[PDB]
Structure formats: C-alpha cells, structure tokens
Amino acid sequence: THPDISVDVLVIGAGPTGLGAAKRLNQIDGPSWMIVDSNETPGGLASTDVTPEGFLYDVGGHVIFSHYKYFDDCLDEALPKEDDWYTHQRISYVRCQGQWVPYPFQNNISMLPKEEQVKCIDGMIDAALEARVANTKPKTFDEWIVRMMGTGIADLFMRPYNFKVWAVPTTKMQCAWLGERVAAPNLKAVTTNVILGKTAGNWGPNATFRFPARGGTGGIWIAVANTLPKEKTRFGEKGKVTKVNANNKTVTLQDGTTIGYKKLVSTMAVDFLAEAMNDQELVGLTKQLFYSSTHVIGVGVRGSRPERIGDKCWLYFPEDNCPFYRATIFSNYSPYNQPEASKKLPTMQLADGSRPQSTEAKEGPYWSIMLEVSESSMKPVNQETILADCIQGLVNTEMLKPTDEIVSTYHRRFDHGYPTPTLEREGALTQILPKLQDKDIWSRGRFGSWRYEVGNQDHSFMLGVEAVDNIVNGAVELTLNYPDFVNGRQNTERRLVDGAQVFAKSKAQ
Amino acid sequence: THPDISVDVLVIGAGPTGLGAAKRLNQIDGPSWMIVDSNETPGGLASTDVTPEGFLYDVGGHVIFSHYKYFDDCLDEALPKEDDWYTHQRISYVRCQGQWVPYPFQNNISMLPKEEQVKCIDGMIDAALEARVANTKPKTFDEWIVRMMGTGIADLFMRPYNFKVWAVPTTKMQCAWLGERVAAPNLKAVTTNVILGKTAGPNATFRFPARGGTGGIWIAVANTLPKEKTRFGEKGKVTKVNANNKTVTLQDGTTIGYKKLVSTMAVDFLAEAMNDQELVGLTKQLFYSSTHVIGVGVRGSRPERIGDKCWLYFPEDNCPFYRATIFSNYSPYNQPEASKKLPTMQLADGSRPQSTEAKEGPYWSIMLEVSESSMKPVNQETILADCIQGLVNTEMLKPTDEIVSTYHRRFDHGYPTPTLEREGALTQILPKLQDKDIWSRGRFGSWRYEVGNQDHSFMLGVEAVDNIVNGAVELTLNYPDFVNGRQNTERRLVDGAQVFAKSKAQ
Amino acid sequence: THPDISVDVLVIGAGPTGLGAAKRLNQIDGPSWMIVDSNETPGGLASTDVTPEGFLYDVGGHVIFSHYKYFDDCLDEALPKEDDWYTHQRISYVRCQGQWVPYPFQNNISMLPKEEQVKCIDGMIDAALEARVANTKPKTFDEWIVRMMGTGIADLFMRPYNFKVWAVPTTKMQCAWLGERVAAPNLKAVTTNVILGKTAGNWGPNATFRFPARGGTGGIWIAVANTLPKEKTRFGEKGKVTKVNANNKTVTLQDGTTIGYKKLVSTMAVDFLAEAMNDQELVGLTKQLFYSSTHVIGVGVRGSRPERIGDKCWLYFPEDNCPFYRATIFSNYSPYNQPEASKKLPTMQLADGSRPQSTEAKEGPYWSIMLEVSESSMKPVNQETILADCIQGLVNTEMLKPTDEIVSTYHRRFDHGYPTPTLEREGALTQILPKLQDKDIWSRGRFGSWRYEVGNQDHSFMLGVEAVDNIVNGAVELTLNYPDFVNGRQNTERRLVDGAQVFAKSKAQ
C-alpha cells in the first residue's frame, strides 16, 4: 500500500535544525525531500513573539557567535541588506553585591569587597597548586568548577548561579559538555588585575555579534525558510505528525495523510518521537533523560534607557534578590523591537507594584527588558507570582526604580527548555541514538539530540545540515559527536555554494 | 588561446592518492575530470616489481590495518573474490640480542636476558615518575621516546632502530606525528608480564592479495575507471605547470586546462615544474630519505622458526637493513612453483655454487629495506652483499643456503622525514598552493608520514575531491589523530547520492 | 621535720634508665645521690628469668644496635672480657605463606607466589607515584604504611603483623614515632630482585650485635649495677617507694623511711607515679595514655637445633596460624642459655600436645624457643590456654615437629609491656611531663616517658644519663625530645671517662 507522498528524505520540524537540513537538501537539489511542522510559522523555539502593545521578545536567545561559515552564508542570503543587521559589542556583566562585575568574573574580582577578594585569590591558589599535580578529569560539573577557580569563586558565582540556570545542583551534572580544555586557573591574570585595580572584560571593538534589524530572531528563520521551494514545505495543522511507523518508514499526519521516506530527519524532542513510534523500548530509555522548563518574562517600560545600563547584552544573577538567572535590555538590540515614541500607551503598573496615577495613554519613548527563570522538580515555580516576583527582582537589582512605569508584560512557559547535561545523559543517549540510527532515523537538534553543547542556533542548524550531508554525501557528523572539535576551529570548508553547484552551473555555459 | 584538453578537476599521479581522487571523481560523476601519470602502469610506489626469475617484490609495503570503510569498499570492488585475498594474523617481532621480541616491545621484555630487563624496568620507573609531574609536551622524537619508555628501552631499541629507519637521529625530529597520546609508560602492564613470565587465539587480521602482489590491487582499482578519462604512459608525463592560467603542459606538447588541480607528485618536483622560485626555496626546507628495497629468492623450504607473515625490525649493527619480511609467506604466488627450474646464483655465505645446473624448488623469498641520507650514506655497490651477510648474522639464512634471485632498486624519495623543520615549511607551502586552487596531497604531496600509508594516501585524494566538490573537511590532512582514533564508516563507495539518483529512474 | 636521708638527686628504679642516671651520677661524683628499687635484683624489665630445668629467658629482649658510645663503655666496663660476649650477624625473617622471607620484606617478595608479587608491585607503583606528589605528612600509622609500600604489602605483612604486635589496629596509632624519614618506596630495588629472583637482606658479615655469654641480658644490668658504690644503693623490700610528696620534695618508703631530694629522676611507670603522688590532676591526664600487656612464652626442647631455623635472630609472624607476633631461637645466642647435654631431664610433653612415652629422665642436647604475645582490651588473651596455643603455633609454623619432646616451659605476663604510640599519646605527654618538670621531677624511661621510640635498653639507659647531665651540667635531653636526631648520628662525644675525670686525675699527678 503506497503512501500519499513519497520522498527520499523527510525532515520533521522547521526550526534551526530542520531548516538546516532543508537548506542543504535544497542546495544539493538531488534526492527528493520534504519538510513538515505543526506550526505554520517556521523557526520553532527560535521565533519571536509580540505583545498586544507591540513589544517583541525572543523565545530562544540570539547567536552571539557562529562557528560555521556555512551558517553565515545562509543568514547573509535571507537578510542580505546591511540594514538588516545591527552589529553590537559582545558585553557581559555579573550582578554581585551591588556591583556589575564584567565577564570574565575572575579577572574582575578587583571590584568586589577586599575581604571577598582574599577568599577568592586563596581559593584559586589552591586550585592552581592542585592542577599542577592533577592526574584525573573532573567527574561532576561541581568538581570542574572548583578546579577551575577555587571554592571562593565557587561560592560567589558559579555554584549558586548554575543552580538558578539548570534548576539542578552542579553536583548532579557532568562536565565533559563544557569542553576538553584543562580545568586549570590563571593566577597571574587574576592577581595582576587586583593589584593594578584594573577592570576589564567584554571586548572592544573587535568581538561583535549581529542582530536582525526587524522581527527579532524569529525574523531570521522566517527569511531563510522563504528561500525554500514552497511546494516541498508543509507548515500548519496540515504538517503535524501524529504517527511514525519506523518499520515500513511511513509517517502519518493529523489529517490522516501518509508520507513515505527512505531517510528520516527528526528534530522534535526524542521523548515525543518515541511515543509517536509507540516503541516502549525507546520510551523507556528516553525517560532516563532530563530537561528543565523555562519562563521567559518580558517587561516594557516608558522612558529613555537608564544611564546605568546603557549598551547591553545579558546580565547574570547568582544572588537571591531575584528569581531570574539572566536578564537583557532587549531594547538595546534594535529600535524596532519596541513601539516608536509617537505611539501612545497607558501605564499598567509601577515597578513597586503600585497603581498608575492616570489611565491616560502617554507616548514613549520605550525600552524593554527580557529575562529567564528555570523550572524543574528540584526547583518549582509558582506560575502566578513569578511575573510579579521578577518585577520585584528588577527593582532589588536596581534595574527599575519603583517609580518606573510598566507599559507591557509578557510571560510564556516552555515545557522543554533546557536539555539537562546530567550525569545520566550520555548513558542514555549512547543507547537511544544508535537504535534510532539503525532504523534510518537521524534524530538531531536541541531536543532531537538532547545535548546542550550543540543546542545553539548555529549548532542546531548545522546538526541538520550535517545529518543531511551524511545521508547523501556520507559526511562525518562532527558537531553531533565532536563539539570540542568544531568549537576549537573555524569551519570554512562547507559553503552555501560548493564546487558541485559551481561546476553544474558552468556546465551549461 | 584554448588548451587541447579542458577538465574541471585534473589529477596528477596514479598512485593510491591519485587513484583515490579518481575514484571519488568517478563516483560523483559530475564535474569533468582526468588523471595522468608518467608511468603506464598505475599504482605508483605501491606497485609490485618482478625479477627475471619470477620473484615478486612490493616496493611500498602493504596495508596491515585500514582506517576507512570507503577504502575497503574500493578494494572489494577491485578484488571481489574471497580467493583474491589471504587473511593473516597481525604480528610483529623485534630482533634484539639473538631474541625475537613480540610486539609491542615494552610488553615483552620478559623475552630479553634478565640483566637487560632490569635496565629497561628501571628506566621505565624513571619515566613513570616524571610523567606523574610532566606539565609540557615532548619537543623532539627523542624526548618523546624517553618519556614513553625510559632510557633503558631507548638505548636498547628505540634510539638505534629509529636512526636506521629515518636516516636521521631521533633528536632532529618532531614527535607530534606519533599522535597526541600522552607520553607516559604503563608499569603495571610491563611489570606484570615480566613477573608472570607471560609473553604478549583468533586475533586481529590483515589481508594480502592472492596474486600480483600489492601492485595488483592498484591495477585492478584503476581498471574500474573510464579509460577515456585516463592517460597513463609517456603520453601522460607532466613537464610544465602554469598556475597563473591553470594550464598543464605534457611532454608531447599536449596542454590541459583545469579549474582545480589535485597534484600528487613530490611537492619539491611540483614547485620545479611551476618555475616558482619562491616555492622552490621553501620546498628545499623539507627533508627526506632514500630507501633501498632488496629482495632475495632462495631454494628450499622456509625456516621453521619464522612462520608468520609479518615484519621483523632490526635495531642492531649485525645488519644494514632496519626492516625485513618473509614475503613468500604472504602468498604462494609471489615466487615460482616448485617444478620450475633455476640455477644457483650464489650461497648466502657469498661463495660460488658447485655447478650451474638448473634445479627445482620449492622457493621462499625475503625482502628488506635500507635507508639512505646525507647523515647516513650507502655504498650502492656493496649494499646487497651486506644485506645477504646480515641475513646470515640474524640467522635468517644459513651460509649454505642457495640464493636463486636478487632484487635491488633505489628510490630517491623514499620517506617524508618528520623533521623539526617540517611543519614550519608545510604551513607556508600548502596554503600558498591552496591559494592557486592546487591541492598538493600524498606521501610526498603533503609530505606527512602520519598519513603517507596506502589507506591514508588514498583518502588524501578522496577527501581532496570531496573538499573540491561537496566542500568536505579534509580530516586526514589536518587531523591525523582524529581519523586514526576512530572508525571512519560514513563515506562509502555507494553513498546516498548514488542510491537516490538511481532509484529515481525507477 | 627533716627526712631520715637527704641527697641532691634521687633515682627511683634500677632498670636500664635508673642505672643510666646512677652511672653518670657516680662518674660525675659531685652532688649526693641515691638509687632505690623495690626489686632486690637490678635490671628491671631487662632481666633474665630461669626455669627450674635451667632455661634462661630474657623478659625484655636484647640490644641489636647501640646508638651511643657511652652505652658501650658501661657495658665494656661491666663485662670486660671478650669471652663475656658472643657476636652474631643481624639477621631477620618474616614468616609468610610457608616461606621464610628475609628482611626487608619488600626486597624479598621475589619468594612469594607470583600472583602475590603482582599485587605488591602494583601497590608500590601506586605508592611511588603518589609519593612523588605528596605534599603532606601521614596522620596515622596506617597511612604511613600505605605510603611506604602500597596496599599490597600492607595487607600481606604490615597491617596484620602490627595488630598482633601493638594489640591495636594501625589506624589508631600515630607515625611520628617511626622517624622523620620520608615515606617513599623504592621501586627499582624491589623490582630488580623480583626480576633477578635475587634474595638478600639480613646483612652480613659486618652487621653484627653482641650478646652476653652468660646470665642472659639480665647479667649485663647486674654487672653494671655492681660498679656502683653499694652504700648509695637500696634494693629490695627496703627500697620500695610507696609515696611521693612533690611539694616538700620527700619520698616515703614502705618501711616508713623518708628520703629528701632536690631533684627526682623517677623511672617508674608515669601512671603509677601519679598515684603515689595522690595528684588527681596527673592521674586523670595519665589515664589518657594507653599500653599493652605482653606474655613471654618459653619452650625448652630436646634434640639438636633443626637446620632450617639455623642462625641467631628474630622471626616475625603476620599470619593467624600462630598467636605470637615474634619468636626467636634463644638457644642460638649462647650455649649457656640452656642446660648442657649431660643434664638429664624428663619429657613433659610432645609438641603435638600429647603425653610422652616414658617419664624417665634423658640427656640432651637442648635448644630453646622464646616468643611474645600481646594483650589489650581489643586483643584479649586466655592465660590458661595461650601456652598450648603458642606450642601449637610453633608446630603450624613448622618450627617444631609434632614429635619434638618439650622439656621445659615458661610463661610470665607483664601488665605494662608496651607503651602504645596512640594518636592521643602526645596530647597527654605534652601535658604530663612539663607539670612533673615544674616540680623538679624528671620522669624518664620506657613507661616513665611513655615513648616507645626510645624505650630500648640503649635509649632508656641514656634517658637516665641525659636526665642527670641536664640536672647537673645543664645538658640537652636529646634522646627524650629528638629521637630522629640521636638515631641518625653516631653519638661519640659523651664517654664513661670525660675530660673532667681525666683532668682531675692528672691534676693529682
């Protein structure tokens, strides 16, 4: 019984990964292919929501750094205008004891209370002397943190911050995900800055990342998707997969439609994939994995951008005076992420939670704040009070004066937000992925692979690109199995226009 | 002006590297391509010569272990019959003080005289203690050796042997080529064997062609190539390379135009043919050694003591060769059958035969290698006599043994020497050539011994093409450690592209 | 009220320590002095007992190495003839798995089952590697052992043997007592003998110790005591101290006699001293000290000395096929430690434990075996049965045949056998000794100072000598406070005839 549709390669999911596979599939333009997604808007969790008042909010951060030229070609194609991008300085600050400590944290303890400085330096001196002798590798994320920068810096930043991040204690996670690099501290660099009292960090003006002028991050994956042949695309309720028969290689859609495939590139969460296949073996193995939920809170506020935050990026918060682990002045990325000044809007509430004087609609200008909070069984989140608690924190950290007028609020909860690099992660993945692979199924992506190391928009995109390259050209899936390898090098070989397309085109001439 | 022939991808050289490139270019079957070689018989320095008496002798050894599936696939295609191959045990012995020490050397010191075992163990104990503290990497091959297995084993084996091999002292060579594995000994392993007296079944295996020798593989492989895209013989000899206009001048005058050039000739010859004085200067910084390949056919049965098909390494001074093997053990067709009659040329002791009568066999064969360089000269007139004598000293030939054949050929460019100055030159030479759309690859193409093996060189060409076409990462070129530490299964002789393009017609 | 007797320096106890003080006091011959002991026979716990059948047994071992020339002069004086001493080779064996493993045990594992050789070598290799990096000192006797020769040799010899010796597990003892010599194994030496199958250790022929030709060890201290002015000695029931009044510097004897002193050198067990002072403070502190009891078993046997046991030395037993931790062929030290061959003695029992054939008295020759068993609250000893167990042990270790005729037996139990180098030892001693010192009481000796490191005859003797030298000439008590210092050097300065005596005799001339 032949299916309704028959393609060589079927890509499920129109996120960075899905589009990655699709963009390479369409570049090779050889075997037949098709891409599906239950959402009519391509980009997935890399999209950009908007508020009724017109405030944009990235659901999945932004690419501050790409490791592949291929990824760059694909972005340059979608948004080819210099006016499509706003280059920004890669900045970073850590909120510690009423201080904005620039990245990296260690090289800036010179602006912490001197007593604290001592506890830190001593801690590193211990880590530096133990490293000089260390003959083993760290077993947990915790051990990895100590060895790298002593207990002192381990009690002020890393430990407490990484809990608010992964909602899981550092002792329950592996550390191989961080890289192959030796866990050894640099005393000279840290002591020097303390002595000179010198402060530094970020990078100027060389280290820069680009952000899309309009539409937020979602606009990027939208533009890319539009470079595809629309007949091969299938987005919306018509593209929602409900059943996956790995045995006869047939996918059933929600309406009932069935698609046959020779190779399957799945970018949905593997735990969902397992159920769609109804394989109690995979469902059992997938349950061994672990993830955290994330609350993306947004806050629009009237007035110009406060001097004390100026040029921006993200801010890390290791302390207790706030529920969020990181924040960001999203208004600093592009003026079009907010309504213009002329736009008039009523004030919903003040920063202290008080009532607005008047309900009248006053005009801008406007600036916007975006932040994130993690949820898991070890770190529960009150869905109702977390938005108000964030606004409180924004005040505690002195990012909002209680007299600040909030014009817009935002709050969405993502069940699958962070593929946790637990200690049991690989023990499970070393079974799951091979099994799926035996069924000619390439499960790749942030939750398709379940490896945070390669969950970035540039990594995920290449996962798809490489999964395909493997299926067709038998290319090695580097990013999937060797994160350190790709990260520690400039990947420039593969381009949007390889010698194949060059020769086939000059072939006509 | 337009050249006589014009192809997208021109491959120069018909060795494993060249044939590797050709195989991928022919698999992809997209962009126009052509492979040339000044020699009319494909295979290059991986070919098999034959003596007038009928003895086979490979000139570039054989593959004991493949690192890629794509390499196996191409071999299966050239020799599809099980009968085309013989499977042998991977084994190795070091001749040290009248003893045959199993590989690996350090795990079998229990074969050495005990007094010597002490000096080895003590040395490793020093190594083990220093490794516990080491915070840097070895800088020379010699440093690496010491850290790995101490001075005891260094003076007994590693140091003397590696000079006989590279014709260059261990102190003049880098050590990164050996891999990125930490230079630290394993006492517990070494001590255990000595204590238990144990000497380290199915075992791992390698395959050798039933007929033709190693060269027979590359001939069969080249046959699966569209003959019209091949040009072997004096008609394919490259005499000039114009990198500016991308044109290659053959010996007969024929000119070939290319977009991409995969050159597999010695990069010092390439620079010459380009008349690029800059490259010639840089290329002079590289170093290499010359190898003498000697072969000896002898009447009678094989010595009982040495039945295994493998390598025998010789660190000592009682023989000029550093490497030897009973080539007749690999396949019974590397030497004439028993019924064939041949006269005795000389006895192993160098004496004269009693008569010139042509008698029957059977026959066994030995091959051995000798290295030559400015730091290690070789008398080409007496080297063979010295080898035979050495074959007596190592008790591989009785002075009474009857020698039936002698083979002797000298290869100018034998080994690409991993010197301390190598990468210093190669990081200039390769990128520049790359800026002219020229992929200089291979044993002497890229000059890296780490990947100068048959299976490595073959992939250097394959990957080079895959880089030119599908924009693949040349992993074997820039990351020997990576490809060597894993099983390269992805790339196949039949990839998804061919499967899908074919089933499409259906 | 004034004491019946008055001296400047009073020495309580006529063991090696007390005798040492007396000898230096008689040599100086300046300040008035007197030495008392409740025992009629001088020598203390370094005496020699005799069985009815005429077998000698040292209750306190014998000197195998002198660390001081002064100790030599005094022995030379007491026993001036060459026919008074027998010089023997310092040899030693450890009984391990049916093998006599020469000292040191590590350098002779080349005699154990090869499977054992492996576990030992690996252990040392681990020890050698950790030592190269070690930046701290061992805290207990156990850590010190592991650091020296790895767990392999630790589980085979050290650990089990040292419990049988100290009646306390190696984890409950300090290791400062062993010396300041760095705990690091010698791999090359050990592996060499294993490879060569070489055997050596019990040094010869210049590593020698001398032994008294007659009277056993006890004869030495009896001869040494005789060199003293008898009117200054007071041994027997007339010399028993029953009370010490530190406040008015008076001692009360059993008969009621009182001796007044300026300085007191008390060589009795410090815990008993505290009790004879009625000082509850010192009694409490002294309770924190720990000791073990020792049973000394003797076995006289008919026949010549077997060939295997051969020469004169000590034998160590880590294994539990015997109750004793060390044994010695006491008949090899001197022919006069047992009856002559013409002496007729009946057979008491056979080694197997059965009753002999006839009760008739037969001739010799005879040989003797001496051994020791420790006792504590953690290692109890059945006093009624331990003798038969030792004899059984001698059979199991194959020192006696079941057919060997036992002619004599000996069994004495010493309550205070060994001063135990527990972890709490110096916590108490650094309190006890100073307090007694403030009262002008030099508490010195095996149980006077409670430090086993210097509890030997040669050490003890000097503890007394140096105590007197400190009292009179203000000398430094090196042996008491710096064990390593004296042991690691040749003490030749102090002689039985110093310049003081020489210049006084020549001034005479």
Added chain:
Amino acid sequence: THPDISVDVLVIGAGPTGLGAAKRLNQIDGPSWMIVDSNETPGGLASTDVTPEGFLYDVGGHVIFSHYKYFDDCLDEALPKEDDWYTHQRISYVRCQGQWVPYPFQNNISMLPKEEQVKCIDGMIDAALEARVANTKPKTFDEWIVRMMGTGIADLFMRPYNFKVWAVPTTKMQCAWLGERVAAPNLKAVTTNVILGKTAGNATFRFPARGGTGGIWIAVANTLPKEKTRFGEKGKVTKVNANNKTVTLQDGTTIGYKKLVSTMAVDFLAEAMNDQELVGLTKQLFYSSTHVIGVGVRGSRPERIGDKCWLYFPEDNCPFYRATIFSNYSPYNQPEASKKLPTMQLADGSRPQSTEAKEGPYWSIMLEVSESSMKPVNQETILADCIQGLVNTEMLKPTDEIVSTYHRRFDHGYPTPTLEREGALTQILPKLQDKDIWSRGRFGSWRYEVGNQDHSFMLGVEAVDNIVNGAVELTLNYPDFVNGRQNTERRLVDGAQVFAKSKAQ
C-alpha cells in the same frame, strides 16, 4: 723540658668566642685554664672604636636576637643594672626605588610601585607552582633565591643586594647555611598584604647604654680571674707546636696545654703551626674584607628614619650594603649638645663657611662596604663615595654639616659560604681535632651561620663543655637545630655549682 706555663686548657683569642670558653671554664672551675689575646682590650672584632671627636662605632654590629639563655645570663652578669640597657623594637627596612620596604621584603611588596608588584607576584606564582613539584634541594645560593621568591624579587632585591654583601655572586655560594627550611614561597601571605594594602612583617632587642657593643665584652671579661688572663703584646701567639702541645708567645714565653681552644682565623692558625698540609687546605677557604664607615652629623635626626635598626641597599646609587642611625641606639654614642665641634665638610662635599666650633646636638650614621678579588674597593675615595651615597639615598641633605668621620678596613670581615667551603672544613676541622685542637669561631670554624656574637660565644662555651663534660657541639654542626629551638638547658649557674655551694652549708 718544661714550658714556662702549663694549663689543662689554653684559649687563644678574647673575642666573644674566646670569652665564651673562658666563662664556662671559669664556671666549671675544675681543670686549669688560661686565655690569651694580642689585644689588651678584650672583645675582638666585637669591639667599639671611638673618633677623636667622641663618636662611637661598633666594628662588628650588635645582637638583635639571642638563641641561648646562657648567653643572656652572661650579659646580665656583665651589665646587671636595667639602666645598662636600652630596649628597642626589632625592625629593618630595604631601600628600593625611593621606597622603604619593611621586613620581610616579600610581605611588604605593597610598598613598591604597582607595576613592580606584578613582576614580583608573577615571579612568586612561578616559584610556588614549581615548589609544588620540586623533589630536590637548591644547589646554589641563587637557586635557593629563585625557588623562595621567584625571579622578580630576585632581580629586584636579592641578587644585587647579596653581591654587595658577600662581594661574591649568588651563584658561587652554597645555600645550606640559610637553614633546612623548605625553599617555597607563601602566595596567600604575600597576596593578602597586597590586596589589603596593609603593611606588616612586641619583638625587641637590647643595646648597652654606654660604651657600645664593646662595653659588653669588656664587662664580661672583667668577671674573669685576671691572673688567668693575659691580654696585650704579652698575649700574642707567634708559634703553635701541635706535636708537643706547646705555644710560644712573642716575648718567648711558652705555654703547655692538653686541649687547645683556638679562636684565631684558622688560616692564620695553620701558618703559626707551620703545617703545610693545613696551609694548603686552608687556601680553599674564602673571605671578604669589610669597610666600616662612620659619619658624625650636627643637628637633629631626620623625621622619617626614627627607628634604630638596619637599612639595606640593593641598588647602586651607594657603595654600602647596609647602614644604621647609630645615634638612635643610645644618646651616649655621640657627644652631648653642649660639646663644641668645628664642621669638617658638608654632605655635598664642599667646604664649611667658618672653622669655628659650634654646639650640637649631634647624630651619627654607620655603614658597611664589602671588598674581595671580585669586588675591588678604592680606599682613597670610598669614604667620599659613601657620603655621596648617603646623599643619594636621601639620608643626608647636601647642606648637612659633617663633624666626624670614621673609616677602618678589616681584612677578614666575613667568612664566605662558598660552594667549596664545606669540602675544605670537613677536612681541616677533623685534622685539627685529632691534634686536640678546637678551632672555633667566626674565622676559627669559618661558618657564617654561627658567626654571630651569640653563636660564636656558644661555640667556645660548647667547645669547653665538649672538652670537659663530653657535651655535643650542637651549634658547630647543627645550626638549624639550635636556631629552631629555645636553648634554655645550660645556664651560668648549673646544678653542679648549686650542689657544691649547698654542700658547704
């Protein structure tokens, strides 16, 4: 034949070492003894000279820390009044880049310029990381310095300073002499101070109120029975016959001894013995000569330099390696304000306005300069260069009026801890010992570790105690042992003397 005099024990030299032997010989009061010295004034190179103007200068420093109670007892006896001593704080400074770095140097790098602190901490971070792995002992003085405090502190202070002191590069000297304390820096201690910006290293030493340091040894000698002494031209040793145990004096007097305690320089001793074997071995020893300069200045003492202590100078803007405001130890080391003295010259070197003698008050400075075959010293200009240095280091204003100058050169100033030292002494000392000669002292034993006044004094004390009571010579053979502990056992009144007195009663 028989000698003019015959004693059981003869002591040669009335310096701290010799007097230490005489003090114990007299305390024991048993065997016959006598002590000689070619100088009528006892104290040796621990004496105190005086300028014609009335300024005192110690030729051999002063004790800042005693390691023996016996040493204290003997000074207490010589100067029994409390008014005899002044107690000052133990302190010292290093002059580095117009800065006064408190001791110890490392713990006060927070006084150096910021940039310099980086080089120093970076250097120590290297030293600390290497010591964590070190498995051998330093072979030279230099190696010891590099391991202890890194190359930064080495190039800035230690290396250049030590050459000015020993007149020999740090690479030519052993390092056992500094002690057996593990050569390893303390980062936490050093970093803490820099971080806290705090400055730190009560602890005191005593200095005689009158007569300077020499006054001490003069009083100590006075406690000896004069008939057993013999100081002056009459006590000069000119010959030593070690075979018949007879010493000849300059006048011709012959002294017969049983044991000889010689405290003269061992190289001179060998000469006086006419023993070519020892003379040869003695040549392997090395020493530096020292110049002791004294400056008398009119007016009050500079504000910033009020503490009486040592000031060390590693830099080359002055020839001296150490200096001290000797006028801060006691107001009696210089003339009283009412004293009238003419100005000899100004600190800038120029001439005075008038030659009239004006009143004080006065203050004083002393400094030391080393000399050797590897560090020559011009004797005719060294004084003027030291004055210039005092100006460069800003201790003297070019307008300061100099009222007195002192300059003496000592051939045998310091016993150099060279690499060859022990190889020579382990032969020389035993050989003399076999001849019943106890060659002890600063140049008698040649070991700088124990060449201080408190050590030297004990070298004699223990030499006698060895000859008489058979005591171990700890100070001679185990400097670390005696230094790392408080030596309280031996006292000026031992139990021997208590029991002899109470025996009379």
